[PDB]
C-alpha cells in the first residue's frame, strides 16, 4: 500500500516537474536536470542562499511559455 | 615745214667765198672818194657778209652762239633735260616715299597685332564626355550590403546563445551517467530529404 | 651773320670784276669810233647799261630766293649745320642701296613691335608656369585618391582571409 | 536500387519510385489468369500509367526539377506504350527508367549540396527555370563573375552539357570552361566535380590579392 | 658739267644747282643781248630823223657784236669760277652734316642683323602660337581634372556613407567582428564535436 | 643772234629757188641795200648827176647774179639731198657722256627695282589685310614635359568600374558566407534538439505509461 | 531498503513543495489534490487548490478549484483522446501561476 502509492506519486512528480534532482550533494546547494521542450538543461544553484520565491521564479520561468 | 633758213656744214669755205665775191663791192666801194672810202667801204662789206650769215641757220642754232660741228648740241640738251628729270625724280623719291611706306608699315603692324590677338580664343574638341555613374547600381549595393550587415550583427549575438547552450548540454552529458549510476536515483526514476519530399 | 650778306656781296665783287673788263678803254673805243650824236646824252646812256646790268643780278637773286623759296630753305640749312656741326667723322650718306635705306628707317617701330611681342610671350610663360604647377599638384592629388580607394578595396578584400579560415573550419562531409 | 514493389494483383501491379512519389501502375489486361496460364506474349499491358503523388505546391525546387526531368524523359520517350506491351520486357524497362531516376535523384542531391555549400566553392546562386540550371560563380579571388547555364537533360550525366557562359565581370573565354568540362569526365557526380574544378583553377590557384 | 651724282644737295634744295647756274647764265646773256639792242635802238632814234649820220647803223651793230663777244669772253671765264664756288661752298651740303631725314635714320643697322632679327621674330610668333595652344590644352585638362575630382569625391562620399551605415547597426569593425565570429565558430565546432562523440558513444551502449 | 635794220630777210625766203639761187638773190638784195645806204651821202650839183653811178651799179649787180648762177654748178640732181660729215676720232667728253649713260642704265634698272619692291610690299599688305578677315599645338612650347607625361585618365575612370565590381564580388561573397553560417547554426540547433529528444525518450521509457490507472486502484 | 526509499520520496515531494511550490496528495473517494504554495510575492503560504476525481468512464475532471478555473473541457478531451497528462498538469501549473497577476 505504502510502496506502490509512493512509487506512483514519484512517477507522477517526475512527469509533472520534468526535473530530476541531486541529493548526494549538500542541501545548501541544488543540482538537477530539466527536460524542457528545448535542449535539456542543468540546474546548479544555492538553495539556502537565495529566497525560495526567486529560485522558484527562476525554474518556472525557464519553462517555454511561448 | 617752218624752217626756211639756209643750212651750211662749212664755215671757212663760205667765209672765203663771201670775201672773194666781195670784190664786186670793193670795186663799187672804189667808186667813192678816198678820204671817206674806208668807213663807207667797211659799212658795205660788213653789211654784205652780215646779211649773208643772218639768213642761214646752223642746224637750227643761232649764228652768234654757233659752235663746232663735231656733235649736235640739241641731243645733248635733250639728254640733260632727261638727266635732270631722273635726278629730281629720285629726289622726290627719297623725300616722300620713305615716309609713305613708313605710314604703310605702321598700319601693317597694327593689322598684324590685331590678327595675333584675335587668335587668342582657340577651342578644340578634347573633352571626353562619359555617361553618369549608375545610381541604381550603387543603390543595390547599398541595400544588399545593409541587409548583410544587419544579419551579420544579428548572428554575432545569436551564436553565443548556441555556445552557452552547448556548454550546458555538455554539463548535462557529464551529469547524466552518475545520476543514472546512483541507486535511489534510479529507484525514483523507475533522411532529411524525407521531410523535403511531401509524402 | 646771315648768308644773304655774303651771297649778295661776293656776287657784287663779281660785278666789279665784270665791269672792270674793258671799262675805260671800252668807253674810249666806242666813243671814239662813234664819238658824235649828242655828247652829253650818249655819255648818259653808257652808265645806264652798267647800272641796269649791275642791278638785274640783284633782282634776279632776290626772285630766285623768294619765289623759289630759297631764303627759308637756306635758313633751315644753317639751322641743320649749327645742329650737327658736332660730328666731324665722315657721315654716312644715302648709298643708293634700297634695302639698307629702307632698314635704317623701318627698324625702330618693328623693334618696338618685337618688344611688345616678347612682353606678351613672357606673360604667357608666367601664366603657363602656374598652370603647370596646378596640374602637377592635381596629378599627385588624383594619384593619392587612387591610393585611398585601392587601400579601401584591399581592406574589404582582406576579409577574404577570414572567409577562407571559416570555410576551412566548416568542414565538408567526407 | 531506389524502387519498391507494392503489389502484383491479377488486375494491376504497383511500383513506387523516389520516396514512393512516382507510382508506376501497370494496368494489365482484365483476366483472371496471368502469364503462367496464358502464353508468354498474351499478357499485354493495357496502361503503363505514372501517378504523380508529389505535391508540387509544397515541393522544393529540387523535387520539382527531378520530377519534371523524369516526366520529360517519359513524354519524349512515351513509346513504352509502343515498345513495352509485355510483362517480359517490363523488368528491363523498369531498370532503364530506374537509371534515369537514380541519375536525377543524385542530381537533385547535387543542387541541394551546392545550395548548402556554395560559398566554399564560390557558387552563390542556383536558379532553376523549367529544366535549366544557372550556376553563378562570383568572387574577387581572381576578379571573376559569370553565370554558367547548364541545360540539364534526362541524359545527364551520360552526355556532355551545352555550356553557354554569359559573361558578367572578367575575362573568361569559352575555351576556359571547355577545358574545364573536358577535364571533368562525363560520369557520376559530374556537377560537383565541375564546380570544384572551376573553384580550383580560377580561384584557388590564383594568389589572393593583398 | 660735274662728275658727281649730286644725289644729296638737290635732295634738300629740291633741284640740282647746275640748273640754277644754267638758268642764270641764259637769263643774263638774254638781258645783255636785249640791252645791247635797246641802247643801239635808242641811238638810232636820233638817226631816223637826222640824215647823213657820220656812222651807219650797221657799224653800230658791228661794234655791238664786238662788245657782246668781248663781255662774253670774260663772262664765261668768271662764271666758271662762280660755279666752282657755288656748287661746292655756298649751296652745297658738306659731308660733316646730317639732313633732317638723315637725322631720322642716323645709326647704321646691318641687314644681316635684320635677317636674323626677322627669323627670330617669326620664330617667336610661332612660339607664341604654340604656347597659347598649350594654354588651351592645359585649361581643358584643368576642366577634366575638376570633373574627375568631383567623381572621386562622390565615390569617397559613398565610402563614408557605407562605413556609417555599417556602424549604424552595431557592427563597428568588420575585421574584428568576423575574426571573433570565426573564433566563436571554432569553439562551437569544439562543443559540437564533443556532443557528437558523446551521442555516438551513448547511442551504442 | 643780233639782227635789225630794214631786214626783209631770215623768215622771208622764197621757196621757188634753190639754196644757191636763194643765196644769190640774198647777195643781190644786199647789193641794193648797199646802193641805197651809200646814195644819200652824195649831192646833186651842176653837170653832175647819178644816172652813171646807178647804171654802173646795176651792171655790177647783173654781173653778180651771173657770177652766182655760174657758181651754182654741181653734180646732176646732187642738190636733191644734203650733205653731212664730221670727225670723232677721240675725245674725253664723249667718254663722260658714255659713262653717264651707263649711269642712265643704272637708274633705269633702279626704277624697275623700286617699282617691284614697292609693289611687292603693298600687295603683301593688301593680302594680309584680306586674309585677316578671311602636333604643333602640343610641342614647341617650354612645357612639353607636362604634356608628354600624361597618363590615360580614361583608364582610371574604367578602373573605377573594376573597383566597384570587386566590391560587388567581395560583399556578395560575404553574404553567401554568412548565409552558410546560418545554415550551419540551424543544423547545430537541430542536432541539439534531436539529441535532447532521445535522452528525454530514454528517461520517459522507465516512467509509468498510465500511472493514474494504477493510482485509482 | 523500504525506509530509505519512502523517506527520500517524501523528501522529493517536500522539495517540490518548497523549492518548486507543488505538492500532490491522494485522498479518500478516488480523489487527488494539487496544493500550490509560494506564489504570491507578499504572502508565501497562500494555498491554491484543485482536486480532481474520476468519472464512470475513466476521465480527468477537476472536482473543485480554489479559485475556480475555466479551461477544463479541452484538457479533458486531450487526456481522453491523446491520453497525455503532462501537458495538462503543466498547463494548470501555468494557469495557477498566472492567477496572481490576473
Author numbering:
A (entry chain 4): 131 to 196
B (entry chain N): 33 to 222, 264 to 272
C (entry chain B): 32 to 205
D (entry chain K): 2133 to 2342
E (entry chain A): 1 to 205
F (entry chain D): 112 to 245, 256 to 338
G (entry chain 5): 123 to 224
Quote from the publication.
Kinetochores, large layered structures built on specialized chromosome loci named centromeres, promote biorientation by binding and sensing spindle microtubules. One of the outer layer main components is a ten-subunit assembly comprising Knl1C, Mis12C and Ndc80C (KMN) subcomplexes. KMN network subunits are in turn distributed into three subcomplexes, named the Knl1 complex (Knl1C, consisting of KNL1 and ZWINT), the Mis12 complex (Mis12C, consisting of DSN1, MIS12, NSL1 and PMF1), and the Ndc80 complex (Ndc80C, consisting of NDC80HEC1, NUF2, SPC24 and SPC25). The KMN is highly elongated and docks on kinetochores and microtubules through interfaces at its opposite extremes.
We reconstituted an eight-subunit KMN network comprising the full-length Mis12C, a dimer encompassing residues 109–197 of SPC24 (SPC24109–197) and residues 92–224 of SPC25 (SPC2592–224), ZWINT and the C-terminal region of KNL1 (residues 2,021–2,342; numbering refers to isoform 1 of the CASC5 gene that encodes KNL1). The SPC24/SPC25 dimer, two tightly interacting RWD domains, caps the complex near the C-terminal tails of the Mis12C stalk, engaging in tight interactions with the C-terminal regions of DSN1 and NSL1. The RWDC of KNL1 docks against the lateral surface of the stalk, approximately 5 nm from the upper end, engaging the DSN1 and PMF1 subunits. It also captures a C-terminal motif of NSL1 that is connected to the stalk through a flexible (and largely invisible) linker. In the KMN structure, the two Mis12C heads are closely packed against each other. Comparison with a previously determined crystal structure of the complex of the Mis12C with CENP-C indicates that this closely packed (closed) conformation of the heads is incompatible with robust CENP-C binding. Specifically, the strongly positively charged DSN180–112 segment is predicted to bind at a negatively charged interface between head 1 and head 2, opposite to the CENP-C binding site.
